[PDB]
Structure 1
Amino acid sequence: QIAPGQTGKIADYNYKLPDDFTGCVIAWNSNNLDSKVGGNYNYLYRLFRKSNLKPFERDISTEIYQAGSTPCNGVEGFNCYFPLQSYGFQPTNGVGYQPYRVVVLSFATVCGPKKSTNLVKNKCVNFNFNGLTGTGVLTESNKKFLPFQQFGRDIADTTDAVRDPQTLEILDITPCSFGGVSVITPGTNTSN
């Protein structure tokens, strides 16, 4: 019952997800801690409620239901019931009646992990450091950045040093090697 698009007694009266839910649902079998032989009536659930929920209504409100036309001031005799029941979890229950711990993860400050390579000096590399990129030779430097400075710039606004973010040491980026290939020749008329 725990999804976008799904229906049921929980999905109408306890726990709705938006039908385009930004997130995931995770669940695992918990017979081995949530259940004991006396009946772990510890966990409750909303068996009855008027109208329907919206997504994410944790409506703790607990008063007697009443269906059709009757008044009800407690007593809960007929056509009116107390809205909650316990789960009768016991370690001897069958698989579909066992307890399960559910977690829903629902979705700027959060990110997954961003994973470094080891760092190679004195070779031509296609580098990335924090937000930037380049092609270069990365080399140890005698520059002295201030503690908060992360990059360092050449006079024509071209980056030419960077702080490594893990080991706080300064690299002197050099451009990777390029040059013209000139062919030097006597005339073909002579020799090839």
Structure 2
Amino acid sequence: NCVADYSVLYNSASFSTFKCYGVSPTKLNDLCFTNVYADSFVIRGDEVRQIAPGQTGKIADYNYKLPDDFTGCVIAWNSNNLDSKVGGNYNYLYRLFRKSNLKPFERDISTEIYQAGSTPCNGVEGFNCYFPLQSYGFQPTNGVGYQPYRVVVLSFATVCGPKKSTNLVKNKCVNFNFNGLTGTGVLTESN
């Protein structure tokens, strides 16, 4: 139920990646849908390579999935000055293990001990069984691939684009359009 100038994000050079997978971005001023949903979080740079349609590995299998058929894009930027810390930052979490690789947009915000092979376990989580939640450790002096990046996902009727207007010429023969209508003539001020 609002206008959405994607053209600002597309033009702004602050982003380390701005990449589209169900749409080509300049058309977003014309393309429209019922909703758009924004997902937002912080990740290691080399692992941002796992955030696309149909990919595999630690994020792609065990955080959240974009489908191969993802109707949308993906943006990301440097966050070193904010999200890394001198003593390290550990506020960010990830669950490393889970039986069955996740489904499209699926969320497993639950945790129990993962466990492997034929063996019973009740907490403890040293041998054969491990607690799958872990923290990150973002530190400013990391290599560029281990530094923190802010990431936003967009999955793409009410959310239209900025349908901009021309200047208006009066008392001249003109090929006009107003709202969802068209016409040609001389536009004179009426009473």
Instruction: State the TM-score, normalized to the length of structure 1.
Output: 0.72
Q: Secondary structure at the match of 1:10?
A: helix
Higher relative contact order (CA 8 A, sep 6+): 2
Q: 2:97 aligns with which of 48, 51, 54?
A: 48
Alpha-carbon separation, structure 2, partners of 1:92 and 1:138 = 65
Tell me by how many angstroms 1:31 deviates. 0.9
> Residue 154 of structure 2 aligns with which residue?
105
> Residue 79 of structure 2 aligns with which residue?
30
Alpha-carbon separation, structure 2, partners of 1:40 and 1:66 = 28
> Residue 129 of structure 1 aligns with which residue?
178
Aligned residues: 142
Q: Percent identity over the alignment? A: 100
Q: Residue 65 in 1 paired to residue 114 in 2?
A: yes
Moved over 3 A (4+): none
Tell me by how many angstroms 1:116 deviates. 0.7
Alpha-carbon separation, structure 1, partners of 2:95 and 2:188 = 66
Tell me by how many angstroms 1:71 deviates. 1.1
CA contact (8 A) 1:40 1:90 kept: yes
> Residue 37 of structure 2 aligns with which residue?
none
Alpha-carbon separation, structure 1, partners of 2:117 and 2:168 = 73
Tell me by how many angstroms 1:20 deviates. 1.3
Tell me by how many angstroms 1:37 deviates. 1.1
Greater Cα radius of gyration, structure 1 or 2:
1
Tell me by how many angstroms 1:58 deviates. 2.0
Alpha-carbon separation, structure 1, partners of 2:86 and 2:163 = 47
CA contact (8 A) 1:45 1:86 kept: yes
RMSD: 0.8
CA contact (8 A) 1:2 1:15 kept: no
Q: Residue 18 in 1 paired to residue 67 in 2?
A: yes
Tell me by how many angstroms 1:77 deviates. 2.1
Alpha-carbon separation, structure 2, partners of 1:17 and 1:54 = 9
Alpha-carbon separation, structure 1, partners of 2:180 and 2:104 = 38
Structure 1 gaps of 5+ residues are: 143-192
Structure number with higher helix proportion: 2
